[PDB]
Structures are given as structure tokens and as C-alpha cells.
Amino acid sequence: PFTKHGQKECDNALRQLETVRELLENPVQPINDMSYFGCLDSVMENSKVLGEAMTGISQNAKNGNLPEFGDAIATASKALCGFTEAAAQAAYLVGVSDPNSQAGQQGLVEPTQFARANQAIQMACQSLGEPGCTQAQVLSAATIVAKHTSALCNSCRLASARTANPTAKRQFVQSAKEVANSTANLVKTIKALDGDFTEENRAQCRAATAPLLEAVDNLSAFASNPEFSSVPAQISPEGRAAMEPIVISAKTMLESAGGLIQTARALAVNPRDPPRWSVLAGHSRTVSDSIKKLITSMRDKAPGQL
């Protein structure tokens, strides 16, 4: 019936937990730009949200409310993932602060949209440069340039926001302004060329493509600069020992939450199963205990990170 959507929500959550668990395998790079204290608050907030989801997961499987069960599962998955990222980020910060450790860095990931927009804009500009292009051809090139430069600027905005490195964060936005400014100028020359196709307006419209192509090339080159590539930190043995409380607790919470969701998936189908209700309460107990142990350890290392 309406169980199918609940079953699939459980499958998605379990897959997502498996993905965030790799963050705990061997932290050697920062996840994001959060401070140690931001990580602390994030773990706090996400655990509140998780605690209410675990009650919603349990009550709605028992009472047969399949849409409310599915939404509890989706909520728990998002909170568990948020939690794990803040714990992996905190773990990294603990490990590299040991004086025998060496820093790592997140590589910037290049949007696949970049390549698409790049090729599209180049072909559209090459078209605008053909000495015999028509008013229909000029309209289609303008349509393609506008669509892909708008998408390029938004990819830059998002890439800027998820880059911790401040030089890369700044360049993504400067590139976005270069693209937007040169696109605005180009379409203005297209507007003039439209209906006045002299060699002089062709030359000007042709000249206006050069700044846009330079902006696009500069952006795609910077995205490949070696100084922004991922480098794994060298965590000292004393660094590793210090991140153990956070890492172990995060893993245990993930293991138990996975077992909780796997059990709730079956209880949503047939909730007349006392053995599985007691398994589920065991897992939920360990989820809570592990969160308590992780938060406690983070609060206590906290003076060293002020």
C-alpha cells in the first residue's frame, strides 16, 4: 500500500549513512569551514532534531501512520548526516592541532556545469564571429550565452560558499562578476548589431566576445590550480589518539542508528514483533549514549581551542 514510500525512505537513509561513515574512516582533511565551536553547536542542534525523530520513527511505526513514519526517517537521516560532518570536522581540527601534525586541505571540486557552459559559450561566441551570421543566428547565440553565463555565475556562488580557502572563495566571485559584466556588454553589442549588420557592428560584436571568453578561460584555469588541490594531513600518533573519543562515539552512533533504521523498516510493515521492538530500543539507547559521550568530550577539550 502506502508502505512502499516508507520502505524507500529507509533505503535512502541507510545509503546516506553509509556515505557519511566514510568521513570517519581516517579524517585527514577538513570537511568545511566550521570552527571547533560551530561544530559543538551543530552536534547539539542536530542531536535535538534526532531525538525527536527517533520518537517519531517509533510511534508512527507502532501506530501505522506511514507518511509520518517516512518523514521521521527522512528527518533522522538529515540530522545524522549533519551530526557526522560536524564530528568529522571537529576530529580533524583536534588531530592537526598537535604540533607534530601537518595541515591538509580540501581540494576544490570543479562543477561539471563549468565544462558544459564553457563549451557552449565558446561555440556561441564563435558563431557570433562568423562574417555572415544572420539575425536569427544572432538571437540563438544570445540565448545560449545568457543561459550558460547565468548558470556559470550561480555555480560560482555555490562553489564560493563551500570553499574554505579565502583566496579561492574570492576568485569564484570575482570570476562571476567578470562573466556577468562581459555578458552584459556583449548582449548590448548584439542589440546594436540586430538590424544594422554592418561590418562595423559585426567587428564590435566580435570584439565584445573576447572579454567573455577570457573570463571563462581564466575561471576554468584557476579551478585547476595545483595550490587548491586536496592534500591529506599528516596526523601525528598523538593527534590520532586525541581524536579517538570523537571518532569512536561518532562511529558508534552511526552503527546504532543504522541498526535502528533497519529494524524500524520491518516494524513499519509488521509492527506485531516484540523481539524487534526490544532490538530497536537497544539501538536507540546506544544512539543516545554515544551522543552524550561525544558532546561531553567536545565540551571538555573546548578551552584548548579558544
Binding site: 538571437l139 544570445a142 540565448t143 545568457a146 553565463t149 547565468s150 555565475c153 556562488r157 564560493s160 579565502p166 572563495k169 574570492r170 566571485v173 570575482q174 562571476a176 562578476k177 562573466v179 556577468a180 559584466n181 555578458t183 552584459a184 548582449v187 548590448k188 548584439i190 542589440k191 540586430d194
Partner: peptide, 23 residues
């Protein structure tokens, strides 16, 4: 679309993008 609308769009995008923080 039409050329007039494309011009409005990229000009409005330029106004928005030029205010973006680099920090």
C-alpha cells in the same frame, strides 16, 4: 525568448552579481 527580454535578464543578473560578497 526574445532579444529584448534576454537583455533585461543579463542586465538584472549583472546588478545582482556585482553586489556579491567576496569574503
Amino acid at each position: 525568448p526574445e532579444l529584448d527580454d534576454i537583455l533585461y535578464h543579463v542586465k538584472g543578473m549583472q546588478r545582482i552579481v556585482n553586489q556579491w560578497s567576496e569574503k
